[PDB]
């Protein structure tokens, strides 16, 4: 339901979580907590960026941050991040991940005009 595209043990953002279809990964957060705990430290603390494009479309709430304290994602700390404020390297690594998995877009809520508006 999700794919971890980037991991930073010591970075501001400890992980980047991308949706792989029309389902919202934030309904699966407990799974995301354990997989991150397998990829990073068991009880990691920091911020997690979520890209929800395939569930949300190319909308103003496509990118959302949430805090993670002692390996638990805190759901009442969600802050919507504007695309102009997300670092460009994360953006292009998400673009690459989509381009290598057209089946994500096939399973998405995106329209054809959306799919070739973000594959510019």
């Amino acid at each position: 339901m999700f794919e971890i595209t980037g991991i930073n043990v010591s970075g501001a953002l400890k992980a980047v979580v991308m949706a792989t279809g029309f389902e919202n990964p934030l309904s699966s957060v407990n799974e995301i907590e354990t997989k991150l705990s397998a990829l990073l430290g068991s009880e990691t603390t920091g911020e997690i960026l979520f890209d929800l494009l395939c569930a949300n479309g190319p909308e103003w709430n496509r990118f959302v941050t949430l805090e993670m304290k002692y390996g638990r994602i805190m759901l009442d700390t969600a802050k919507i991040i504007d695309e102009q404020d997300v670092p460009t390297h994360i953006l292009s690594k998400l673009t690459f991940t989509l381009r290598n998995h057209p089946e994500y877009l096939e399973a998405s809520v995106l329209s054809p005009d959306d799919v070739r508006q973000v594959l510019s």
Partner: protein
């Protein structure tokens, strides 16, 4: 469906039109005449070979409007034909009540048109008030019970006309055009501030739905039509809104009903205890009919039922719900996107009825 109450019919053409409707439809005229009493109106009685006798009661409102009653005869199905013929007499984009303001007018060029229009057997104009800055007249007709309010604001030079566009409207508008060289007034429908959006009229929206359903239009269930027409009444206003998911609600709801009806007609009843999870699978990203049901249908039927159920499930999944992380819930902030999704939904609905 349609509303036949308080129509702005040209009262002086109701008999003629009705008869000419029975002249082209080649039905047999049986009776015309006013209603017995206490109800000032008109009644038409006709029939086709081998069906019951249809009666249509056209009552004359004190507004100057008219109300058609076709749910009264021994054949309402065919009475509605005369009702709809009379309904289509009116431009559906014309206003029920017109407020129109023109520029560059003095009293000396407006009283002559008022007087000359009141040079008819049923027209008469009264001076309502003289404020010495805005002078207002009322034009009433004793034959068609409809009146118009004409207010000229003098230091502004602005002539404003309010009322139903029925009899004195028509005569004054055209007389004013014919004397003061205003040749297009009969052709300007709307002129207002650009950023103000108005809900489109039900009949205009319905006509668009027909042009969208095409052949899949005579088959629409009446609740599905009321939903899709309501949605269009808003969609066609192109309003400036923070979010447009609401505008897709009619399409998704209609898809569920139409899909459920078709599946029932094909031996696949969708109950509440079971749902759509006992008639579909999801291999990866499309939903597909289970093999025991696909084995009895042809590719086309399977392709439309699965495409409908996939679209309905994929879109409904977040548009009819919200996340616990509330701000991550799916929104649509762009009208073009909304309309894309809606035209898709319309093709799915059309095929559900047609295939």
């Amino acid at each position: 469906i349609r509303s036949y109450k308080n129509l702005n019919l040209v009262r002086a053409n109701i008999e003629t039109e009705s008869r000419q409707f029975i002249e082209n439809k080649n039905y047999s005229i049986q009776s015309i005449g006013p209603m017995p009493g206490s109800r000032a109106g008109l009644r038409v009685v006709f029939t086709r070979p081998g069906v019951n006798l249809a009666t249509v009661d056209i009552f004359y409102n004190g507004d100057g409007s008219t109300t058609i009653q076709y749910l009264t005869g021994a054949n309402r199905s065919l009475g509605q034909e005369l009702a709809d013929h009379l309904f289509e007499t009116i431009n559906p984009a014309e206003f029920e009540q017109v407020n129109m303001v023109l520029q560059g007018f003095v009293e000396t060029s407006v009283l002559p048109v008022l007087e000359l229009s009141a040079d008819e057997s049923h027209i008469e104009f009264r001076e309502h008030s003289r404020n010495a800055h805005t002078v207002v007249w009322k034009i009433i007709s004793t034959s068609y019970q409809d009146e118009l309010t004409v207010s000229l604001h003098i230091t502004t030079g602005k002539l404003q006309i309010q009322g139903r566009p029925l009899s004195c409207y028509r005569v004054f508008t055209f007389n004013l055009a014919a004397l003061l060289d205003l040749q297009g007034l009969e052709k300007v429908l709307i002129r207002q501030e650009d950023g103000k959006a108005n809900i489109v009229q039900q009949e205009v929206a319905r006509t668009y739905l027909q042009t969208v359903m095409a052949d899949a239009y005579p088959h629409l269930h009446v609740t599905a039509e009321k939903l899709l027409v309501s949605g269009l009444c808003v969609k066609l206003a192109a309003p400036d809104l923070p979010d447009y998911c609401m505008l897709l609600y009619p399409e998704l709801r209609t898809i569920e009903g139409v899909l459920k009806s078709k599946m029932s007609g094909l031996g696949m009843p969708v109950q509440q205890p079971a749902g759509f999870g006992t008639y579909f699978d999801k291999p990866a990203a499309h939903y597909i009919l289970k093999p025991q049901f696909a084995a009895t249908l042809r590719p086309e039927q399977i392709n439309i039922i699965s495409t409908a159920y996939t679209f309905f499930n994929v879109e409904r999944h977040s548009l009819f719900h919200m996340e616990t992380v509330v701000d991550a819930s799916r929104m649509i902030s762009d009208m073009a996107r909304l309309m894309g999704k809606a035209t898709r939904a319309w093709g799915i609905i059309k095929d559900l009825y047609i295939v």
